[PDB]
Each structure stands twice: as C-alpha cells, then as structure tokens.
Structure 1
C-alpha cells in the first residue's frame, strides 16, 4: 500500500536513533547554509537564490535552537584531546551541567572526526547509572557541545591524592568499575581508556565512567580495529596492535582494572617509569617487570586479583564474562552485594557548599578560512544535534 510506505517513512523520522530524524534533518539544512553562504560561492545563481529563499527561516531556527549563549560558563574543569569540559549553568532553568566542547577545526585538521558519534550515543542511550548521561547535544559553526550530568565528587586521581586508600574502599570502587564496564560491554562497546581520570564520583560518592571518545563498537566476534594518549593504563596487546594491524577486544578494559587496583593499594602505577618509552617497555615486559613492593599493605586475594588481570590476554580474567570476576574472594565483604552496591553508603560522600562547588577538581583558537569553492566542513557533523 501507498499509505503503508508513508507509515514506514514516518517511523524512520520519529525514531530518535535514526540518521534522518528531525534534528538531523535540521542539521542537514543548517550545515548546508553554513557551507554555502560565502560571497564568492554566491556568484553561482543556484546557491544565491537558495540562500535568499532560506535566509529568514534559518535565522529563525538559529535563534530558537539551543546554543552556547543559553549557558553561563562558570569554570573550565578539564582539558582534553579536541577541547575541554566546562562547568555551566543553564540561564533559564538555573540548573548546573558539565558541558564538553570539541573543536570542529582541530578534528578536521587532525582527521580524527568520527569518535564523537559513539561518545554521544553511549551517553544519550545507555540509561545506566554507571554511564554519564547526555541531556543535550548541539552545535555551532566552530564547536560540538555535549551537555551532561555534572559529577561533583571529582575523579579517582583526586581521591587517591587526598586519601591513603584502604583495601575495603578499593574493593568498593573496583567493584563499581567492574559493573560499569560490564554494562558498557553488554551494550557491545569497549572503553579502551579505563583510568582513574575517567572514573567520576556523583553527589553521593558513587562511580560513573566518562570520556567515551575512544569507544569502538565490537563486531560479532567481540573485537575492534586507533591512537593513544598516556600509556600507564594501556594493555600490551593494545601497544603491539598500534604498530602492526592486530585486533583486540574487551579484555583491554579488564587489564586497566588490574592497573587501577594496583594504583589504589600501592600508591604508584605498576609499570611506572620517568619517560613514556620506559613505561611502554615495562608494560611489554609485564611477566618480569610487575613487582609488589615489600612495604605495600596488600592482601593475598588482592595480589591474586591484580595478577589475574595483568597477564597475557589468552589467560586473562574477563575473557569468559564478568561472573568469574564477581566470584573472586577479594570481593567478599560485609557491606554490599553485586545487585545493590550502588544503593549502599559510599566510602566518601562529597560535602559540597553550593551547586557550582568544583572543589574536588583542580584549577585550570583558529577557524576555517573563507573558502574559494564548496568544501563541506560542516558535513561531518550533520546528525549531532540531540534534544532529549
């Protein structure tokens, strides 16, 4: 039926996961007008007349759609790959959010301009208390923006520097990391950058993972095909794949949990060295180079858990699913079960003096040229806008 073809078509456009939803279609139109509205290109009558037709309505859309001017920048709370995270207050609602900015220019120039799709999608659609929630994604000519729930507790780096961390606490945060990662892994995704910087504490001292900009979608075999920042938390299979064309899967996140628990209990990274090259070399030689210092206050079970994660991938814990991790005797405790850990009293419940208190965080351009012909610099970002 002709009516059924129109039913099907409407169903694609109503779906919030769809590439041709209304927001994506509006990005389509906006991005086209941005890419065309340059006096040189307007020598083409097709382009000139089209812009004259859509001048009014695009100005009208631009005004109504969500934009940077809707938010007051309170403070920059972190810097990263293609931009920054700023603590913001939405002007009209007076509600506080974390807002991550990514430079379009820098992404085009450094050629790393599709990681943001999975970063957006996971935060938008996880519906998991272990994943930072995305409320809005929007864009202007210069930047992509992700408005996310603010995590006033700070990161595990900050926690480790302020508390000598007892094993009982280490057990708690590790357990939350495990469930967090299992939730991500059950969505078919690998984090690939599990480190204390990206483990954030909410207003009640409970963990969520953040920075989903190195997320890859796993294939039907559990594997993924790109770059890396700092090496301390990266698994040895990930290091060999960068030079070669090797594969790796979810086990690379489980390595990092081993590294995390060593950091927490010992106070240092297991493969610490002064240079990056030193660290890289120690990680490749993990069979020899892993060594618990004789002064470290650590249980036999905690050593056994760290040692089970810090092996070659083929014998590593977390290949055969999360259940073998959960049953490890290290995790035996009086305080929580796996089904309820996140609804128990956290070790450190942050004490905050206002809704913009960022005291658990440490204190802290160039554009496209006016092009001679059509280049389509906005085309990679059509579909980014998301209004929940």
Structure 2
C-alpha cells in the first residue's frame, strides 16, 4: 500500500507566517521525528480569489523540480477544506530578516548568494523550460547551513524553450522588469533583471528603484541609470548595470547562451559552476540555530501567537509523496 499523508501524522509546533490564504506552521512528522514547514491553504480563499491557476502551477513546478537551491516539496495532500504543502524546513529564515539587520552584505556574501540563485535559475530555464518571474528578496530563504532556498513557484511560466515569449502581467511592482512594464511579449531574461534587483539590495542596502507612488517608481525602472556606493567595486557595478539594462536583448543573460552570459562575467571570476551546484562553496554565514524548533530567524509577530485551527476535481494532480528521505 502507497504511503498516505494526512494532517494527524504531524505535530503543530510554531506559527511562522499567517495571512488571507492561510498559514505556515513548523511541524514534526510523528513517525520519523523530522521537521517541515507546512503551508496550509484554505480551499475557499484560493477558489474565491482566482488563485487556483497559481496554486496548481506551484504544485506542478514543486513536483517536477529538484535543485539544491529550490525549495523542495516532501508531501502535498488535501482535506475537503484544506491544501497542504509539506515543505523542506529552511531554519535560516528569510534572507530579508538577515539583510534588514545587517543593512548590507559584503561583495563576497552577495557573490555566494547570487551564484546559488544563478545555479537555480539556469536549471529552471535550461532543464525545465520554466521562467520563474517572481525573483525578489521576499522569496529567498536560508537553509540550516546558510545556503539559499528560492520559494514561491506560483508565478512560474512552464513550456518556455529557447527565445519563447510570455504575456502575463505579474510580479512585485518594485521588482518588475522594464519589458514587463512596457507590456511587450517578454522572455526568460526577466529572471536576470530579478537577479540584478536582489544583488543590488544585497551589496547596496536599498532597492535600485523606489517611490511610494507606482507611476513614478516605473519611470525610474524605465529610465534612471542606477546610482551606486563609493565602497562598491567596479566588477559589482558592471554586474548590476549589466543585469539592470532596460533592454532584455542588451541585458546580461538576455542572449542565447542565457545564464552562461552571467556565469562568465568578471564579478564571478574564479567560481567553478559545477561546485556552486555541489554546495562545495562554504557559506559566508552559518545560521546559529540550536535545534529545529529554534525560530530565532523568524518573525516574533507569528512565533509568539498560539496555534488555533480556523470544487474537488480542480485540485486533481495536487497530491504528492517524494521519493527521497529526510
């Protein structure tokens, strides 16, 4: 008999996040003593907000992908009223928690993270024919060793081989690529724009383009030549200007060699790309967690809270059990 996963096979320990569509809880599988982050989604709030397409895209990408820097789905199962994603638990918390406190990262620290993101995106593009589209600091986490985890696969576009184009208008206003705003028919190069915004935020301490009014913010993305700090070297200014070229064709990685264009840039000199993949590169920060229940790198606004528990043909191919252990 096939391994069946249900809610009662988990101990519900800590609230990590909570919102409109549901909540994230730190869980332990009773049978194995292993810890996971269960994302519980209210079937009604997904159905009501027209997020079914996104949820299923997330489940499909999660089932079909395996990379060290992509968050891994252990189990996905459902009740009459709930959608459950049993995710690999990232003990290092959100990268925003870490950058919000350090203000800036060293060139060497952003180098290490950017190379891991490059590895993951090269894989989605070259191997899986998937365009990620939602690369922002908000979707980056750290595992227990200090390696990057990219999360949130709902905004993915599948079946994109070669110079293939997309039409959807999605992403976080602040991270949206020029081509996306110009409402064109954009390609895989939107992920490299994303890489530039995140690495700028990393090495600089602020977004390259910001204004509270959406109209004005867009104009900066569309026109402003990126400002830089005096402490930042030239290689990093090149990479940033490179990924932040307004024209996807001009942009570093916008060419037919895709990620190879970025991997060869001077900022990445000396790195062995097969080693980036292999976690052979030593992390610049080691999360200082004492146990898996140590939620020091998580928001107290959720952790301190007490956990309280709050059509069918649509979520057909949702269920999953991974073939891997742990």
TM-score (norm 1): 0.74
The offset of 1:330, in angstroms, is 1.0
**Stretches of structure 1 lacking an aligned partner (at least 5 in a row):** 1-21, 24-63, 368-376
Matched, 1:72 2:11: yes
- Other-structure match for 1:315: 250
Counterpart check, 1:362 vs 2:296: no
The counterpart of 1:261, out of the listed 191, 199, 208, is 199
Supply the distance in 1 between the matched residues of 2:159 and 2:199 (Cα, whole angstroms).
26
- Number of residues of Structure 1 aligned to a counterpart in Structure 2: 307
Is the CA contact 1:131–1:208 (under 8 Å) kept in the aligned structure 2? Answer: yes
The Cα shift of 1:143 comes to 1.5
CA-atom RMSD, angstroms? 2.3
Q: Is the 8 A contact 2:145 2:287 kept in 1?
A: yes
Q: For the residues of structure 2 that align with 1:133 and 1:80, how far apart are their CA atoms?
A: 22
Instruction: Show the counterpart of 2:108.
Output: 168
Aligned ranges 1:89-128 → 2 under 5 Å: 89-128=28-67
In 2, the alpha carbon distance for the partners of 1:202 and 1:386 equals 22
2:209 alignment partner, one of 256, 265, 271: 271
**CA offsets per residue over residues 35-62 of structure 1, 9 Å max, x none?**
xxxxxxxxxxxxxxxxxxxxxxxxxxxx
> 1:165–1:219: structure 2 CA closer, same or farther, 3 Å change rule?
closer
Q: Report the alpha carbon displacement of residue 80 of structure 1 after superposing the two structures with TM.
A: 5.8
Please show how residues 39-58 of structure 1 align to structure 2 within 5 Å. Answer: none
Q: Higher helix fraction: Structure 1 or Structure 2?
A: 1
Give distance in 2, aligned partners of 1:217 and 1:125.
Answer: 11
Shift of the 83–225 alpha-carbon distance from structure 1 to 2, 3 Å rule, reads farther
Alignment of 1:300 onto 2:241: no
**Which of 251, 260, 263 is residue 326 of structure 1 equivalent to?**
263
Q: What SS does the aligned partner of 2:200 have?
A: helix
> Using the alignment, how far apart are the partners of 2:180 and 2:16 within structure 1?
29
Aligned residues of 2:140 and 2:149 also touching (Cα < 8 A):
yes
Distance 1:291 1:387, change over 3 A: closer
Q: Deviations over 1:297-346 (max 9, x none)?
A: 2111111111111111121111221112111111124xx42211322210
Contact 2:134 2:171 in 1 (8 A): no
Are residue 212 (structure 1) and residue 153 (structure 2) matched? yes
1:197 aligned residue (99, 121, 138):
138
